[PDB]
Design an enzyme around this catalytic site. Structure first.
Site, PDB file in Angstrom:
ATOM      1  N   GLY A1366       0.790  -1.215   0.000  1.00 53.55           N
ATOM      2  CA  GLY A1366       0.000   0.000   0.000  1.00 53.55           C
ATOM      3  C   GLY A1366       0.823   1.266   0.000  1.00 53.55           C
ATOM      4  O   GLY A1366       1.851   1.359  -0.663  1.00 53.55           O
ATOM      5  N   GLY A1390       4.102   0.296  -4.030  1.00 51.75           N
ATOM      6  CA  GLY A1390       3.602  -0.930  -3.426  1.00 51.75           C
ATOM      7  C   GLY A1390       2.256  -1.395  -3.962  1.00 51.75           C
ATOM      8  O   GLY A1390       1.566  -0.641  -4.647  1.00 51.75           O
ATOM      9  N   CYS A1391       1.892  -2.639  -3.648  1.00 51.96           N
ATOM     10  CA  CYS A1391       0.567  -3.166  -3.973  1.00 51.96           C
ATOM     11  C   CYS A1391      -0.558  -2.209  -3.625  1.00 51.96           C
ATOM     12  O   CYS A1391      -0.752  -1.866  -2.460  1.00 51.96           O
ATOM     13  CB  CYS A1391       0.313  -4.483  -3.245  1.00 51.96           C
ATOM     14  SG  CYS A1391       1.106  -5.891  -3.983  1.00 51.96           S
ATOM     15  N   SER A1392      -1.289  -1.791  -4.650  1.00 60.58           N
ATOM     16  CA  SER A1392      -2.564  -1.088  -4.510  1.00 60.58           C
ATOM     17  C   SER A1392      -2.493   0.235  -3.765  1.00 60.58           C
ATOM     18  O   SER A1392      -3.492   0.669  -3.209  1.00 60.58           O
ATOM     19  CB  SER A1392      -3.589  -1.989  -3.821  1.00 60.58           C
ATOM     20  OG  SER A1392      -4.089  -2.976  -4.700  1.00 60.58           O
TER      21      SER A1392
END
Lengths: 1486, 66
Positions: A1366, A1390-1392
């Site tokens: 995140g 980062g992820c999402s």
């Protein structure tokens, strides 16, 4: 005919007698005592006639003991019994029977002084019974005179007196004149010791024979005995000490006064002695039985002031006894004289001795004299006095047992004085409870001696004592008990089928029964019987008000208040009105309660939106009652009713003046939420509730008036007050608990509504979750239902369709527990929810019937169902909902009319643009259509935007630009460009308003929520000033909005060319739709996201599972590539050039324009055959420029050109130039246009714009626009609105790109959770190096960063870079980033990090918007989850191309170009490579 | 072929709007709980002051009690 039974055993009869006397007494059935006594009297005489004189005698005593407080244990006690209401209908005859017995037992000699004492004071003991049996009594006297061996004269005197007094015929005996002489013989005038009485007797005799041949006093008394009485008198403390009297009987009436006066002085002139004489003197006064006069009364008053003053002067217990005796003989004088004021002084002196002597004996004597007086005075209106007196006694008692002892003298059934009203017994018992019982501090049930069942029921009903043996009592007594206790232990089946034949409570059965059912219902949290018993009460109790002709119980008063309140809380508004009106009708009896009827009638009118009657109610109430003198309870009642918004007229001002200035100036304690005046807790709770209600409605007013912030603050005060109200130690009362339920649910409804209005999904989720939680544990059906109805609407708005189903099921279930016919506002809500709009607007007519004309409620429901109503019949309040509805209704109508003309139908299925044509300066008629459209343009312009929720502001904006677009393609319009400008900033408003509200509401000082304002107007200037500023920036950039039209489903592009000073916009109809593309993508994204989670990857162990995960992701990647392909090749057919970064060479453009038009001239049937070239429709330059922007070398060049042709043909068509495709020379268009385009491209200059800002609406954010083939090579950042772009550019003096220095103070975070260890391996190197030769730089690695360090990282870095899940939400709250004003350019790799959770018609959010609001000028994240090897490939490449190294320079790339050049390194080009996105301004490192 | 991998999806620090204090379990009991509307709730001893300004025959016996 009646039978007679021989009685063999009298003890059987006694049993039956005592059994009946006990029951009758216990059930307050006083009149049956009379009829029983009558039988008993007959039993006594039947005994007398059969010569059972011993038995008859003790039967008399038995009769008396069973019917009086006082007890007798001889006939002498009967004879000298006082009259009371308890016995005065038989006492007379009882005494005659007792005299008969004394006669027939020949006991006259032994009874003699008592019989004399009796008849001496005949006025008191006998001659009160107005129906006194004369002949009997006077005959009894003659017979006593006959048999007595002494005092024959005394009897004689009395007998003559009676016969005169009662006008009896002497002839019940020879001559009456002779009788007197015979009495006068020496032996007859022999009286022995009883000479003391003679004076009394003769005096009574004198009276009837004064002015006749009266037997004079000197016939009896010699002159000697009579002279020397007075002779001695005025020559002397002169009394027979041994006999407690004066030395002389028959003391002269005048010589009394000289003795009287003597003693007075003697007092003035040791205390032990004086009293002794005092007793002597006053005992002779009683004996003599003189009529009261001022002289005696003066001495009395004086003698009793003397005693009182010298109580403390008494020490010995000899003087103590003397005192009690003197007080005793004096009290008897007061009863002989009917001197109640004077007796009450003797009670006072006794009480004072009880205190000074510290004696329970005196106090017991005091209590009883008090009681005596009560029985004698017989004024059940007085008894408040007694209870308050007994309060002071009890307080004075020396111990706990002694207090309970005194209490029992008062808590005694003969204190009821044969009163046959429930009102009196409740009144007596409650006061005895409040003022006396509570002082006893008892924790176990005491069955108080000599008291009724009813008395015990009301008294312990009010107590909190645990185990009361109530089941000993008749059902109706237990019912009052249960109702008092809030505990219900009676079996339902039994309550209907038992009955006592004799009970006072049978007189009140219906009332007791409905009070029980009301309280039973409430106890079980139901309304089962609410309607049944409200009707019962109105028609069979309240209606028989003047039949019953009786004072109303407090039991009933409290009932009615509790009933109104439970009706109101369940919205039984019809019953409420009928009840209230009926009460205010029976005002003769219910005047004390009518303040409640008035308040509750008002709230019922309001609940039924009968604003007419509510206002009549308002202004009457306001004038008709003053607050300065109203007690706090009535003032609370008055004020609470006046709070409702509909009682004003959207006048937040007037409202605030009233409750904020006027009302506090007149009743401050209405606002003492700190309880400084220390009210009873029950009223203090009610004060807090008042202020809760004020703040709740103040929220409603503010928000209805576009004051979102202060409405939020109000709401929060309301909730904080409620939290503090619950912490108060109180055992919350039912009425207040319901008040607080209504209020607390309201403030959740209000807060959620306020946050829906500004589109904040984030806060709505929070509140809806808090509310949902609470509901669960609750049990009140009307509250549970209403909340479920609300949450269901909320789940509809946020489109959480699963919860929507679940809470519709729950809401429908919950409705079962409601009375559908009584609560119309819950029923219409139910009918609405279930799509039964027909059954809805018509159950509103069956509920108001002929009253339908005084309620706005069926019109309010018309507004909820989308209708707009007649303005003249719409409340000013709901006028904005009205117009909003009208607009939409007007739109559906005009759009549907146009749409059945093939011309307009085709136009709505065409790429449309504005401005497309230069101005001059028939299924559906063209003038009619221009008219209806200009009408729509102006109706849209009329409405006040501040009255709109964000989602409506959105639709109104799109409706506004669609109307402008249709109009401009159809005619030439007044103020052409200005309308496009105001429309550009209108469509920007709903982009800006949620973000600003988010920012403002988050920097709110929290002190504001515990102390007991932007708007669309100023925001409108900022939005249009932004656009004016951007235009004037002369920046060589494109600013292109991408939006979705909710109404039409169209894609919506606009473009802003600051350098060209040009504004253009176009509507794309759309093979898949925008909502289908959104579905297909979300499915892909949520699946790939899934493939990414450690739950899944952790379970991958074998070679086989490895290949499956890879098959799936490569497959997901192709699905996404295909979707974007579809979009490219569908959505922008013919207009991909709108996005083109190319600028046409102006000299070349003009030669192309000449040719272009020549080509149209020779190849379009219209231009070939009609008018001349000066009448031809001329197309705008930017449309022509689109042709020059095509690339003839591209493979699909002709499709794109063909689509451009269609576009241009369409422009000419809608403006009135028909060209049958049948006869256009497309071959020649094709050849000649391609020729001129090839010539232009081959010779053109290459000047392009510098950068492209995509203003991306929240609805379009998820799409990876930047990866479309015509976008993927462009320098692009995203922005959420014109206002954000222009402030960001103002922040950096309009200088692109953003030079950012990299030579120090750079922050980094790497693998903050040790779950990305290969990533750590890759970047460990460069990052740790930068902290070295680059000052004030910080690195956090394999280490969870703590909130304060990255908050300082963000606000104190030239660069912030973060690698891990995140955007760091798990280490720092959304709130604090948002409080910042300047944040570092962030690489949220980062992820999402750039993902957004979506919530239907509300605005979504995510980490991305928060940074922007923290004043971040460039933030870079991923739209979904990415996998580590590929994304780190991208990151590595991103840094290198931008120049992020340790040897800080040269010609590095901007963050924009650097990103688009770096996508390709990813193996999965879409699932990973399409994920990164930038918001803000492009930056380059220096 | 060796798989690729994703950081653990942690928890965002909880959002709590506008200085909100949640209603406790105690508070909830106080809202559920019926108490009778009828329940109500409400030093030196001082002396009291003084104010200012053969007989009846068988048939005769039965007549008496009737």
């Amino acid at each position: 005919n009646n039978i007679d039974l021989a009685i063999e055993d009298i003890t059987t009869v006694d049993h039956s007698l005592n059994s009946i006397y006990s029951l009758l007494k216990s059930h307050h059935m006083w009149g049956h005592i009379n009829s029983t006594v009558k039988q008993h009297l007959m039993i006594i005489v039947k005994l007398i006639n059969n010569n059972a004189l011993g038995l008859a005698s003790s039967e008399i005593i038995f009769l008396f003991n069973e019917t009086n407080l006082f007890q007798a244990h001889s006939l002498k006690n009967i004879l000298l019994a006082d009259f009371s209401t308890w016995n005065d209908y038989y006492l007379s005859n009882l005494k005659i029977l007792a005299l008969q017995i004394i006669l027939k037992r020949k006991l006259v000699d032994e009874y003699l002084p008592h019989i004399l004492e009796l008849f001496s004071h005949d006025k008191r003991y006998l001659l009160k019974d107005p129906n006194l049996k004369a002949h009997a009594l006077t005959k009894i006297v003659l017979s006593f005179f006959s048999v007595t061996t002494s005092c024959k004269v005394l009897f004689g005197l009395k007998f003559l007196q009676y016969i005169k007094q009662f006008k009896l015929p002497f002839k019940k005996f020879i001559t009456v004149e002779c009788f007197s002489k015979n009495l006068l013989h020496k032996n007859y005038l022999e009286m022995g010791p009883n000479k003391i009485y003679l004076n009394s007797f003769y005096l009574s005799y004198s009276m009837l024979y004064d002015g006749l041949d009266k037997i004079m006093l000197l016939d009896i008394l010699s002159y000697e005995e009579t002279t020397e009485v007075q002779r001695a008198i005025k020559s002397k403390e002169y009394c027979n000490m041994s006999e407690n009297r004066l030395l002389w009987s028959c003391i002269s009436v005048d010589d009394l006064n000289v003795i009287l006066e003597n003693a007075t002085n003697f007092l003035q002139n040791h205390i032990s002695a004086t009293l002794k004489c005092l007793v002597c003197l006053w005992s002779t006064i009683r004996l003599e039985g003189l009529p009261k006069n001022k002289d005696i009364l003066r001495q009395f008053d004086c003698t009793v002031i003397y005693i009182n003053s010298n109580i403390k002067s008494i020490n010995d217990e000899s003087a103590a006894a003397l005192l009690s005796e003197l007080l005793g003989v004096l009290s008897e004088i007061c009863i002989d004289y009917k001197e109640p004021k004077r007796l009450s002084n003797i009670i006072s002196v006794l009480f004072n001795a009880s205190v000074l002597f510290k004696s329970h004996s005196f106090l017991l004597k005091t209590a009883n004299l008090e009681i005596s007086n009560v029985l004698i005075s017989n004024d059940s209106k007085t008894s408040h006095r007694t209870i308050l007196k007994f309060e002071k006694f009890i307080s004075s008692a020396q111990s706990a047992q002694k207090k309970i002892e005194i209490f029992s003298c008062l808590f005694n059934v003969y204190c009821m004085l044969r009163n046959d009203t429930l009102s009196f017994v409740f009144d007596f018992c409650q006061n005895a409870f409040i003022h006396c019982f509570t002082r006893l501090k008892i924790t176990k049930f005491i069955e108080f001696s000599n008291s009724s069942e009813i008395m015990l029921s009301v008294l312990y009903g009010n107590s909190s004592i645990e185990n009361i043996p109530s089941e000993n009592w008749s059902q109706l007594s237990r019912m009052i008990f249960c109702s008092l206790r809030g505990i219900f232990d009676l079996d339902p089946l039994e309550l209907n089928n038992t009955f006592d034949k004799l009970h006072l409570l049978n007189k009140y059965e219906l009332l007791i029964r409905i009070v029980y059912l009301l309280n039973l219902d409430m106890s079980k949290h139901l309304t089962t019987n609410l309607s049944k018993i409200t009707k019962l009460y109105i028609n069979k109790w309240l209606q028989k008000s003047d039949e019953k002709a009786e004072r109303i119980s407090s039991f009933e008063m409290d009932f009615v208040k509790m009933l109104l309140c439970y009706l109101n809380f369940n919205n039984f508004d019809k019953l409420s009105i009928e009840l209230s009106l009926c009460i205010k009708s029976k005002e003769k009896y219910y005047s004390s309660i009518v303040p409640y009827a008035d308040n509750y009638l008002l709230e019922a009118y309001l609940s039924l939106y009968m604003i007419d009657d509510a206002l009549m109610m308002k202004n009457q109430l306001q004038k008709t009652m003053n607050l300065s003198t109203a007690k706090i309870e009535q003032a609370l009642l008055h004020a609470s009713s006046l709070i409702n918004v509909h009682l004003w007229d959207s006048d937040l001002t007037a409202f605030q003046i009233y409750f904020g200035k006027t009302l506090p100036a007149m009743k401050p304690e209405l606002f003492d939420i700190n309880n400084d005046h220390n009210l009873p807790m029950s009223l203090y709770i009610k004060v807090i509730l008042l202020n809760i209600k004020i703040f709740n409605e103040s929220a409603k007013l503010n928000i209805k008036a576009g004051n979102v912030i202060s409405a939020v603050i109000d709401c929060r005060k309301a909730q904080n007050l409620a939290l503090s109200l619950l912490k108060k130690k109180n055992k919350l009362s039912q009425g207040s608990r319901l008040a607080l339920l209504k209020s607390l649910s309201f403030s959740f409804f209000q807060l959620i509504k306020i946050h829906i209005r500004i589109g904040s999904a984030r806060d709505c989720e929070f509140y809806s979750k808090e509310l949902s939680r609470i509901i669960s544990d609750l049990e009140e059906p009307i509250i549970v239902y209403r909340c479920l109805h609300f949450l269901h609407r909320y789940y509809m708005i946020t489109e959480q369709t699963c919860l929507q189903n679940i809470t519709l099921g729950k809401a429908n279930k919950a409705f079962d527990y409601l009375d559908a016919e009584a609560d119309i506002t819950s029923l219409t809500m139910f009918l609405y929810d279930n799509k039964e709009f027909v059954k809805l607007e018509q159950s509103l007519v069956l509920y108001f019937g002929d009253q339908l004309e005084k309620t706005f409620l069926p019109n309010l429901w018309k507004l909820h169902l989308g209708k707009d109503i007649d303005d003249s019949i719409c409340l000013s309040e709901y006028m904005p909902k009205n117009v909003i509805n009208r607009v939409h209704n007007m739109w559906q109508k005009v759009m549907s009319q146009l749409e059945e003309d093939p011309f307009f139908k085709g136009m709505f299925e065409s790429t449309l643009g504005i401005p497309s044509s230069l101005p001059v300066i028939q299924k559906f008629d063209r003038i009619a259509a221009i008219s209806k459209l200009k009408q729509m343009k102006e109706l849209l312009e009329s409405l006040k935007l501040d009255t709109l929720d964000n989602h409506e502001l959105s639709k109104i904006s799109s409706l506004s630009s669609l109307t402008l677009t249709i109009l401009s393609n159809i005619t030439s319009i007044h103020n052409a460009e200005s309308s496009l400008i105001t429309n550009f900033s209108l469509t920007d408003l709903p982009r800006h308003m949620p973000l600003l509200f988010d920012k403002v509401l988050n920097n709110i000082d929290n002190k504001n929520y515990r102390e007991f304002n932007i708007s669309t107007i100023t925001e409108s200037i900022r939005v249009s000033a932004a656009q004016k500023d951007l235009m004037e920036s002369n920046l060589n950039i494109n600013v292109i909005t991408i939006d979705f039209c909710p109404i039409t489903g169209n894609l919506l592009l606009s473009k802003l060319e600051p350098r060209r000073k040009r504004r253009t916009h176009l509507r794309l109809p759309l093979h898949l739709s925008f909502p289908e593309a959104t579905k297909k993508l979300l499915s892909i994204i949520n699946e790939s996201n899934q493939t990414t989670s450690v739950e899944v990857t952790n379970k991958i162990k074998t070679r086989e599972e490895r290949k499956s995960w890879w098959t799936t992701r490569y497959d997901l990647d192709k699905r996404m590539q295909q979707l974007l392909n579809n979009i490219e090749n569908s959505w922008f057919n013919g207009v991909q050039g709108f996005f083109s970064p190319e600028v046409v060479d102006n000299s070349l453009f003009e030669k192309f324009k000449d040719k272009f038009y020549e080509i149209l001239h020779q190849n379009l049937p219209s231009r070939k055959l009609y008018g001349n070239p000066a009448m031809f429709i001329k197309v705008e330059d930017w449309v022509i420029e689109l042709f020059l922007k095509l690339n003839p070398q591209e493979i699909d060049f002709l499709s794109k050109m063909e689509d451009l042709i269609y576009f241009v043909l369409d422009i000419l068509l809608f403006h009135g130039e028909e060209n049958a495709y049948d006869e256009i020379d497309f071959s020649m268009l094709h050849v000649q246009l391609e020729e001129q385009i090839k010539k232009y491209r081959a010779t053109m200059t290459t000047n392009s714009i510098f950068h492209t800002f995509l203003v991306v609406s929240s609805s379009c954010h998820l799409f990876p626009w930047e990866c479309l083939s015509f976008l993927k090579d462009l320098s692009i950042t995203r922005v959420p609105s014109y206002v954000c772009l222009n402030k960001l550019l103002s922040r950096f003096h309009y200088q692109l790109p953003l030079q950012v220095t990299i030579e120090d103070n750079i922050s980094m975070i790497l693998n903050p959770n040790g779950d990305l260890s290969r990533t750590e391996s890759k970047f460990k190197g460069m990052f740790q190096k930068i902290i070295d030769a680059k000052p004030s730089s910080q690195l956090v690695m394999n280490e969870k960063p703590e909130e304060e360090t990255l908050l300082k990282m963000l606000q104190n870095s030239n660069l912030f870079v973060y690698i891990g899940h995140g955007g760091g939400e798990q280490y720092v709250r959304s709130k604090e980033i948002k409080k910042c004003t300047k944040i570092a350019p962030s690489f949220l790799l980062g992820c999402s990090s750039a993902a957004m959770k979506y919530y239907g018609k509300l605005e979504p959010t995510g980490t991305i918007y928060t940074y922007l609001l923290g004043g971040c000028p460039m933030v870079l994240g991923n739209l979904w989850d990415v996998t580590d090897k590929d994304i780190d490939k991208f990151s590595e490449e991103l840094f290198e191309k931008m120049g992020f190294r340790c040897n800080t320079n040269g010609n590095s790339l901007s963050v924009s170009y650097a990103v688009s050049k770096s996508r390709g390194v990813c193996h999965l080009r879409y699932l990973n490579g399409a994920a990164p996105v930038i918001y803000g301004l492009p930056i380059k490192f220096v | 072929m060796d798989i690729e991998i994703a950081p653990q999806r942690q928890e965002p620090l909880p959002y709590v709007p506008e200085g909100y204090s949640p209603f406790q379990q105690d508070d909830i009991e106080k809202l559920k709980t019926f108490n009778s509307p009828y329940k109500l709730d409400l030093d030196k001893v001082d002396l009291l002051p003084l104010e200012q300004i053969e007989g009846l025959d068988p048939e005769e016996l039965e007549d008496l009690v009737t």
